Amino acid sequence: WXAXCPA
Amino acid sequence: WXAXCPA
Amino acid sequence: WXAXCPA
Amino acid sequence: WXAXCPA
Amino acid sequence: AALVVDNGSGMCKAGFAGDDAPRAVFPSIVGRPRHQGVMVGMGQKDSYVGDEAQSKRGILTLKYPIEHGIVTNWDDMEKIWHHTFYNELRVAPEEHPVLLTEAPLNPKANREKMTQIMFETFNTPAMYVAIQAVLSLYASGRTTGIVMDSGDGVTHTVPIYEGYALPHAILRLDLAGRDLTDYLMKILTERGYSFTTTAEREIVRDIKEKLCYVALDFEQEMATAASSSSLEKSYELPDGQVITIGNERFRCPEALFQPSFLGMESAGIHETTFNSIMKCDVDIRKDLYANTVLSGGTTMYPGIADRMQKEITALAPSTMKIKIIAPPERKYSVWIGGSILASLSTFQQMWISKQEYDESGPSIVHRKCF
Amino acid sequence: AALVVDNGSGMCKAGFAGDDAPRAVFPSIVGRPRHQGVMVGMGQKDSYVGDEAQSKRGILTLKYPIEHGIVTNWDDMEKIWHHTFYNELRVAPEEHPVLLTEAPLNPKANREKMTQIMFETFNTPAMYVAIQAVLSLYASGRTTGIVMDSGDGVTHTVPIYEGYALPHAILRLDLAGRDLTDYLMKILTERGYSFTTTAEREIVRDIKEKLCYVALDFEQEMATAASSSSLEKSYELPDGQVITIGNERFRCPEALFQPSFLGMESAGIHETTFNSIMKCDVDIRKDLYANTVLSGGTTMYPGIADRMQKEITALAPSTMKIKIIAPPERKYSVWIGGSILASLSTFQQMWISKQEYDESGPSIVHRKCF
Amino acid sequence: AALVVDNGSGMCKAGFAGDDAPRAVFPSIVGRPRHQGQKDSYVGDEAQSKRGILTLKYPIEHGIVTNWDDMEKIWHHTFYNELRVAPEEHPVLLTEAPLNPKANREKMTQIMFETFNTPAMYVAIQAVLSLYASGRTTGIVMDSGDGVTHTVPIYEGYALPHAILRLDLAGRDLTDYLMKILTERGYSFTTTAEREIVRDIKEKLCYVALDFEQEMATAASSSSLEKSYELPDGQVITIGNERFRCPEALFQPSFLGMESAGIHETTFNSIMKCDVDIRKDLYANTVLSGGTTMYPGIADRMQKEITALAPSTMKIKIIAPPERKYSVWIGGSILASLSTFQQMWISKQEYDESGPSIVHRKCF
Amino acid sequence: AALVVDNGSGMCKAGFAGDDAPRAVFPSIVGRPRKDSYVGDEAQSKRGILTLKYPIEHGIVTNWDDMEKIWHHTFYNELRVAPEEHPVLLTEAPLNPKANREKMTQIMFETFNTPAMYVAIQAVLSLYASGRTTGIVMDSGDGVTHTVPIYEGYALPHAILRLDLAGRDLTDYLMKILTERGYSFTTTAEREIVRDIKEKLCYVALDFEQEMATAASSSSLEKSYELPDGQVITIGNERFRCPEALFQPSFLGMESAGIHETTFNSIMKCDVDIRKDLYANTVLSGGTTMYPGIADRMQKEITALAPSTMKIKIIAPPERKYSVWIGGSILASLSTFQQMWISKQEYDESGPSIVHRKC
Ligand SMILES: Nc1ncnc2c1ncn2[C@@H]1O[C@H](COP(=O)(O)OP(=O)(O)O)[C@@H](O)[C@H]1O
Ligand SMILES: Nc1ncnc2c1ncn2[C@@H]1O[C@H](COP(=O)(O)OP(=O)(O)O)[C@@H](O)[C@H]1O
Ligand SMILES: Nc1ncnc2c1ncn2[C@@H]1O[C@H](COP(=O)(O)OP(=O)(O)O)[C@@H](O)[C@H]1O
Ligand SMILES: Nc1ncnc2c1ncn2[C@@H]1O[C@H](COP(=O)(O)OP(=O)(O)O)[C@@H](O)[C@H]1O
Ligand SMILES: [Mg+2]
Ligand SMILES: [Mg+2]
Ligand SMILES: [Mg+2]
Ligand SMILES: [Mg+2]
């Protein structure tokens, strides 16, 4: 992801 | 609530 | 260590 | 060698 | 003087009668640390209540003691009241009467336990519980019109004419500002943002109160958002990473008017407001239509005053006139009405006296109270 | 025929429509040699993709293009798909339609580039994208039941009461097999084994698939393991060393039902299925309880079917019967559903034609594919 | 008077609590004469004096005790020769790296409770103790010792176990690497006796380059980066571009062949595993400790590397106390002298009834 | 027709590429009387009158004046072919000072002006001769002993170990034990005789304690060797004592580990997933390794250290003495190798530094 997690 | 929703 | 590295 | 051993 | 304590789902307000604004306004959350403590001498408290919880929300599991206007956990709400009555407002309740506000349609055990705790744990001299929607009229200074109360808690549309509230026309739509937060965080996953935690939900609440707005036409703004990229407003996160939201600014407010987006089968805000009027009599219908009053934190969206007027106008007859009155102090409309109510001399005989409660038991909240 | 593809965080299943088993199953990893080539006699390819990289994983920096069901790097996914069509299936996609799967609640840009790549790089006549968990009921031959899909990187439950899928209860948790593998080596250091490289990551995954299991009662089983009972097993590393794991056998799979071990506030796997059922209608719950269907590799632990049944029975009312269905071939359940869907005559009109994409660009995938 | 003993992989610091500096510090090396009234095993500073004869061997490797027969010798030397106090009346505090084998701390409790007869005991993480010395309460603690480099983020005293990262690359691994690239110039060191000569070189002349690519080209032409060192035997050696390559393995572990990321990336990943709401305070309160972070200019390089990865809006503040070499011990002095800590000592009776496993339940 | 030249620490090999055996082998010894200098077979024949001096010591050239003599002697006295037409594929031990290899590129590019040049690791070429691709290489030559593990062609630099125990050290150790029986030697010419005794009478015992007790209990292991003057000498326990110093360096006084432990420690420096392949493909090379039964003893010692389930297979072709050169012939004849040649134009643009960037 972009804002949140790594993905 | 008790029956319905979660409250 | 035991399984992995040396220590 | 230079520093250490002979060569 | 009395203590107008307007407890609510999002925040609870505390103060004194005769004032213009509440003295203490803090979030109504009770967080408990999950990570273990490693440093000695810091003296961390067992639980954090109010603004202290919000500051250290990164290591807490924020649980709201009130959900949908019903006190789910009665042990944490005793802590919130204790924090309200001792630290922020800082007056011993045993010397002053205490007034509370309560949703119109709610379980009768909720008002039952509210009286039991105050009259015994805090030993207040007197009490009175009023409807949150009704109190909005006192702030507006009018005895007629409907109040479209809607906040983090459950939305209410209570019509009152000449001070005689109509009970059969009261509607309780469970769609609220909290449901929009869940919907907004669900539709924000399309851009790659995943806020799924009790702490990150507070971040989503901040975005909704700042950049979100109501579009006059959903279909036209949908084309404008797709055609033009000028509807994007960057927002900065607490960690310093900026985010960009496009059509989600007005996509989440539109869930209020079309609850089909969240999957709920109930009608929207305008239909619920329209149905509240249609239940009333024909003769009084003229006055209640031109004196509608908004309230609560949900109705603070930019353009909701114009959008609601248009939707309710088409359903209503064309010759008739619609006047959406939107005061700028609608956030504290429930509290400000309480301040007027407590100072009135004709009402000071309506409190539940301490002796009266003991003789009749906790059931005194139905007859002596509202 | 249709080239049904089941790209995922772990191994990607690729084959043909109408078959009962995937033709080629290889890990979806891409690795490059970190060292420098010295021997010049044999070829040193820039990057090894698929089962080729697994054999020579010692000298490779394995990196997964997929993380939590989202394509993090689009350069490597082109390599994997090219390896699938031209090196495993040995067919040209220019003549055969391609079916693909995507996890629900995924970024809209993820499936936008998926359609873009095939329609311009591989030039397939048709395409379709379907939810991974939706196809799982097609393999089981049922039209009702909540799908508990648990892949390598995602764990999502989507209730399907009938031909219509409820969209307000499609939950999604990022706790899956990959996170468990990272947790297994975190608690393996408590015994003296240090796995800290991606080459050693694969060794840990083999241990999880062969020795890990779910205990019916975690607290009682903990006492038995602390007594040095027959729970201790022996596993042989590629080196030839023999390692013994005791209470770590059931501690790693226990992170699914108690995510607090991983520091995640999200509720357990048993609870997230309970929540999804509750958000459905009252009359619907009578069928979702009795038709729960597991899927994915992560639900291949011995005892996951019995343990989940006990947890749900406590939460659910006693009258309702919880019949957890665990097909013996649930590892490839998602692919088998895709094979059945493609062969159906009704599905022939759901394809995305090449001319259809040509007129509106990649935005079609949000209109036809659900 | 609670003792505070930090038995690190390198030199061990021992001294009383309530003071500001360790009472006695000496290398943790035990050596015996090579090949064939000299005593069998020389420990502590005595081994350093006769390092040209004895086979120097480190009892602790990568923060793990490898020979429990040797660790009894060093502890016997500290309590009876350096501090010269009887351990039978004072409590003893120990420091250990995080993510260590459970069998490591179990044996430490067994030894002192049975052999040294210490009435009390507590085991605390080295990173946590480092935060006490600075007087701070939050901020990640990048502790890099001789054999263990770990970053333990702490917010308001509530440690985050899932965000703790441990990397085996540390000061000792740099000593082997510097010895490897010294043979490139023409100087060869093979025996463990000559390793301590290399460690002397790394302490005095070795430093960190701000812009590593620009340093090679500049150092290739001019000899402004060449410094001359004097060997103990009288020989004078000159080392040029090797001065900055040795610590750059901290930031680019690919030189040693390790797949793990550098200290700058390890610190960045540790903060990322934490929540968003506490990333405000972790960026502005980063703390360094340990001898591996004592290179002149390492603080400046770390700030630049993290700022590139972190958003430009955020502020990266690398707190570098001047006494970060003894930060682990100094913080432990405050903990033992605190009145609140007196209820967490592992008394003899509790260990007697619960066995060696008590150390897991009463320590972090 | 690249002129593959392996300037080892004695017994340098040279010959045309594409063959299978070295064209000429002669000791890398330059001696002067105590003509002006003699090098090669003429020096060994007249070793009594000269003072033999090795230009190369421990794989490092200690004097470039003598190195030019043997190199001039190789192309103009043994091969009898000018080097102006063919490239040269030199060999150099790993982990050597850069000043050693920089001069090697410079000296021929200026004095001999060969069209091309290349420097190859002596351990890598050994694997080429056997045709294998995986498995560590034990290039225990003279002067130096190095292990360079290779897996699928990707040599791992962090696991390249270099040990200073080799044949020259063993010759000095065989010097000391022989003096205990009265067979003393002083001059460098006498030392060449001691190398002869090592080459035909030394063997690696399977174990000390059984053989040492046996050697002190009977005289079945006695061997009679005549020294080149005519008188015969008898050596006993020295047969299995000097060779075993490779495995127990404590006899020499050096602290480093033995041959078996150096191989054992080199493998653990590699990744776990490739240790299994290296254990079953160990390769041996070098003159020192030509001891009888060194593979059998190394098989046992590594097996004790390695896990029981592991399989140890010490591959050692019978012609392991010229393994480096044979591998060097294959590399020079490869079609793909013609691009890696260091051209004459590439030398002048970057000076002598071209050896580091291209090799
Ligand atoms: N300025 C604003 N603009 C848009 N939405 C707002 C604004 N302020 C509050 N809200 C919404 O209203 C909610 C607060 O409701 P509030 O009126 O405080 O409830 P209560 O009546 O129980 O105190 C918040 O959850 C937020 O979503
Ligand atoms: N028999 C098994 N037992 C436990 N875990 C398994 C088993 N087989 C596979 N897994 C784990 O499940 C993960 C997902 O694999 P799978 O569901 O087959 O494909 P996908 O990654 O596409 O969902 C793998 O990473 C693997 O670690
Ligand atoms: N002034 C210095 N400059 C650079 N490196 C140093 C300096 N002092 C010590 N070191 C290195 O730091 C390493 C760890 O030292 P120390 O902090 O005493 O270990 P410990 O982790 O046990 O506290 C030593 O091996 C040494 O090489
Ligand atoms: N058959 C043998 N027995 C014992 N030692 C030998 C034998 N052959 C060669 N050696 C020794 O091995 C050493 C190295 O020989 P070689 O491998 O030909 O040279 P280099 O070390 O240059 O490769 C020589 O010094 C020689 O003494
Ligand atoms: Mg309110
Ligand atoms: Mg899957
Ligand atoms: Mg330390
Ligand atoms: Mg050789």
Q: Indicate whether H232 and H262 sit together in one domain.
A: no
Exposed, middle or buried, E273 (CB in 10 Å: 0-12/13-18/19+)?
buried
Chain G CB within 8 Å of residue F34 CB:
yes
Task: Kindly state whether residues G11 and G110 are assigned to the same domain.
Answer: yes
Chains sharing 3 or more CB pairs under 8 A with chain F: A, C, E, G, H
Q: What's the distance, Cα to Cα, between the start and end of chain G in Å?
A: 23
Cα end-to-end distance, chain C, whole Å: 4
Q: CA-to-CA distance for H272 and H277, rounded, in angstroms? A: 10
DSSP for residue G326? G
Distance CA(H293)–CA(H247), nearest Å, equals 13
Contacts of H19 by beta carbon, 8 Å cutoff, 6+ apart: H329
Chain E nearest-CA residue for B3: E107
**DSSP label of H206:** S
Q: Say how far apart CA F211 and CA F206 lie, in whole Å.
A: 9
Q: Give me the residues of E, 36-95, that contact F with CB < 8 A.
A: 61
To test the pocket of ligand 1, the residue of E4, E331, E335 to mutate (highest count of ligand atoms within 8 Å of its CB) is: E331
Q: Quote helix, strand, coil % in chain D, to nearest 5.
A: 0, 0, 100
Residues F147, F63 share a domain? no
H helices, E strands: number in chain H? 14, 19
- Resolution of the determined structure in angstroms stands at 3.7
CA dist C1 to F191, F193, F243, G100, Å? 9, 6, 12, 10
**Taking a C-beta distance cutoff of 8 angstroms, is the pair H7, H91 a contact?**
yes
**Residue closest by Cα to atom 6 of ligand 3:** G203
Classify residue F278: in a domain, yes or no: yes
Question: Do H11 and H104 sit in the same domain of this protein?
Answer: yes
Statement to judge: residues E124 and E240 lie in one domain: no
Cα distances (angstroms) measured from residue F326 to each of F184, F295, F303, F336: 25, 8, 11, 15
Q: Which of F234, F255, F276 is the last residue of a domain?
A: F255
β-strand pairing of F3-6 with F98-102: parallel
Which residues have C-beta within 8 Å of that of residue G334, sequence separation ≥ 6? G132, G133
Q: Which of E163, E164, E7 is nearest to E71 (CA)?
A: E7
Chain breaks in chain B (C to N over 2.5 A) after: none
Can you tell me the distance from the alpha carbon of H354 to that of H347, in angstroms, rounded to the nearest whole number?
A: 6
Gap from E172 CA to chain B (nearest CA, Å): 14
In-domain check, residue G278: yes
Instruction: Please give the angle made by the CA atoms of F358, F361 and F366, to the nearest 5 degrees.
Output: 120
Residues in a beta bridge with G64: G61
The 10 Å Cβ neighbour count of residue F300 is: 15
- Report yes or no on G256 lying in a domain: no
Burial tier of F334 (Cβ tally within 10 Å: 0-12, 13-18, 19+): buried
Spacing, Cα F7 to ligand 2 middle (Å): 13
Q: Do G160 and F263 touch (CB under 8 A)?
A: yes
Question: Is the CB of residue H297 less than 8 Å from the CB of residue H327?
Answer: no
Q: CB of G62 within 8 Å of any CB in chain C? A: yes
Q: Give H85: exposed, middle or buried? Use CB within 10 Å, 0-12, 13-18, 19+.
A: exposed
Whether residue E71 contacts residue E65, with contact meaning beta carbons closer than 8 Å, is answered with yes
Is G57 found in the same domain as G24? yes
What's the gap in Å between F106 CA and the centre of ligand 6?
Answer: 14
List C-alpha distances in Å: E262 to E184, E185, E209, E222: 10, 12, 19, 18
3-state SS, residue H208: helix
Contact G10, G98 (CB under 8 A): no
In one-letter notation, the amino acid at residue E363 is: S
Residues 6+ apart with CB under 8 A from G151: G127, G140, G141, G142, G143, G164, G165, G266, G267, G270
The span from the first CA to the last CA of chain D, in angstroms, equals 4
Q: Which numbered ligand comes closest to the C-alpha of E151?
A: 1
Domain assignment of residue F215, yes or no: yes
F263: closest CA of chain G, how far (Å): 6
Q: In a 3-state reduction of DSSP, which class is residue H129?
A: helix
E119 with E13, same domain: the answer is: yes
Q: Minimal CA–CA distance to G110: which of G341, G344, G352?
A: G352
Instruction: Give the C-alpha distances (Å, rounded to integers) separating H330 from F33, F150, H1, H128, H139.
Output: 25, 54, 12, 7, 18
F230 and F303: one domain?
A: no
Task: Report the distance separating Cα F281 and Cα F287, nearest Å.
Answer: 11
The rounded distance, in Å, linking the Cα atoms of E161 and E11 is 29
| Secondary structure (DSSP) of H88-127 | EEEEE-SS--HHHHHHHHHHIIIII--S-EEEEEHHHHHH
Return d(Cα H331, Cα H125) in angstroms, integer: 8
Q: Cα separations (Å) of F270 from F220, F308, G1?
A: 19, 6, 52
Q: Does residue G142 form part of some domain? A: yes
| Domain end point (choices F233, F255, F277) | F255
Strand partners, F5: F14
Distance from CA of H153 to the nearest CA of F (A): 5
CB pairs under 8 A between F and H: 80
Q: Do residue G79 and residue G21 come from a single domain?
A: yes
Q: What tokens appear for F20 in the block?
A: 């009962």
The number of distinct structural domains making up chain H is 3
Q: Is the dihedral of CA F53, F56, F57, F63 positive or negative?
A: negative
Beta bridge partners of G239: G227
Asked if G344's CB is within 8 angstroms of E38's CB, the reply is no
Look at phi and psi of residue F68 and say left if phi exceeds 0, alpha if psi is from -120 to 50, else beta.
Answer: left
Helix (H) or strand (E) holding E53: helix E51-55
Contact of H25 with H321, CB cutoff 8 Å: no
What does DSSP say about strands H137-140 and H282-285: parallel, antiparallel, or unpaired?
parallel
In a domain, residue F260? The reply is no
Q: What is the dihedral of CA F69, F75, F81, F85, to 10 degrees?
A: 180
For G234, residues 6+ apart whose C-beta sits below 8 A from its C-beta are none
Round to whole Å and give the CA distance between E215 and E221. 7
Give E-chain residues touching B1 at CB under 8 angstroms.
68, 70, 107
| Alpha-carbon span F291 to F274, nearest angstrom | 13
- All residues at 6 or more sequence positions from E346 whose CB lies less than 8 Å from its CB, including other chains: none
Q: How far is CA G142 from CA E248, G127, G164, G177, in A?
A: 40, 7, 10, 22
| Ligand showing the shortest atom-to-Cα distance for residue E330 | 1
DSSP structural state of residue F86: I
Dihedral over alpha carbons H164, H166, H171, H172 (to 10 degrees)? 10
Q: Burial of H81 by CB count in 10 Å (0-12 exposed, 13-18 middle, 19+ buried)?
A: middle
The answer to whether the CB of G267 falls within 8 A of the CB of G151 is yes
Same domain, E31 and E101: yes
Q: Which chains touch A (3 or more CB pairs under 8 A)?
A: E, F, G
| Nearby residues of E7 by Cβ (< 8 Å), 6 or more positions away | E28, E66, E77, E80, E81, E100, E101
Nearest to H210 by CA among H244, H257, H235, H165: H244
Q: Compute the distance between CA of residue G205 and CA of residue H22 in angstroms, rounded to an integer.
A: 49
Spell out a b/e string for G272-291, using b for 16 or more CB atoms within 10 Å of the CB, else e: bebbbbbbbbbbebbbbbbb
Is the Cβ–Cβ distance between E287 and E159 less than 8 Å?
no
Owning domain of residue H143: 128-165+257-315
Looking up residue H90, the CATH number of its domain turns out to be: 3.30.420.40
What CATH code is carried by the domain that includes residue G228? 3.90.640.10
Q: Are G128 and G155 in contact (CB under 8 A)?
A: no
- For residues H201, H205, H209 and H213, what is the CA-based torsion angle, rounded to 10 degrees? -40
Which of H246, H265, H292 corresponds to the end of one domain? H246
The β-bridge relationship of strands G318-319 and G286-289 is: parallel
Task: Point out which residues pair with G217 in neighbouring strands.
Answer: none
Ligand 3: residues with CB < 6 A are G 8-11, 145-146, 171-172, 199, 202-203, 290-292, 294-295, 325
What HEC string does E161-212 produce? Answer: ECCEECCCCCEEECCCHHHHHHHHHHHHHHCCECCCCHHHHHHHHHHHHHCC
Ligand 1 atom closest to the CA of E9, numbered from 1: 22
* Rounded-to-10 torsion of CA H153, H155, H159, H161: 110
Instruction: Specify burial of residue H285 (Cβ count, 10 A radius: 0-12, 13-18, 19+).
Output: buried
Q: How far is CA G152 from CA E115, E238, F84, F102, G310, in A?
A: 49, 21, 43, 37, 19
For the beta carbon of residue F140, count every other beta carbon within 10 angstroms.
Answer: 20
Rounded Cα distance between H1 and G319, Å, is 64
Ligand 1: lining residues by beta carbon, under 6 Å: E 8-11, 151-153, 177, 205, 208-209, 296-298, 300-301, 331, 334
Q: Which atom of ligand 3 lies closest to the CA of G10?
A: 22
Determine whether the shortest distance from the Cβ of H84 to ligand 4 is under 6 A: no
Same domain, yes or no: H207 and H294: no
Same domain assignment for residues E110 and E170: no
Q: Would an 8 Å CB–CB cutoff place G100 in contact with chain F? A: yes
Which 3-state string (H, E, C) describes E252-269?
Answer: CCHHHHCHHHCCCCCCCH
Contacts of G75 (CB under 8 A, 6+ apart): G5, G7, G111, G112, G116
Cβ density class H97-123: b for 16+ within 10 Å, e for less: beebbbebbbbbbeebebbbbbbbbbb
Q: What is the DSSP letter of H251?
A: G
Instruction: Specify the residue for token string 């005892």.
Output: F303
Q: Which residue of F has its CA nearest to A4?
A: F174
Q: Give the whole-angstrom CA distance, residue H167 versus residue G146.
A: 38
Residue F262 lies in a domain: no
Please list, in sequence order, all residues whose beta carbon lies within 8 angstroms of the beta carbon of residue H251, skipping any fewer than 6 positions away: H173, H241, H244, H245
Is residue F39 situated within a structural domain? yes
d(CA H149, CA H138): 9
Q: Which of E40, E58, E236 lies at the smallest CB-CB distance from G275?
A: E58
Give residue G78's Cα distance to chain centre. Answer: 18
Phi, psi of G11 (to 5 degrees): -70, 145
Helices (H), chain H: 41-45, 64-73, 98-107, 122-130, 167-179, 188-201, 208-215, 238-241, 259-268, 272-279, 294-305, 323-333, 344-350, 354-358
Contact G260, F199 (CB under 8 A): no
Instruction: Determine the length of chain H.
Output: 359
Distance, CA of G55 to CA of F115 (rounded, Å):
66
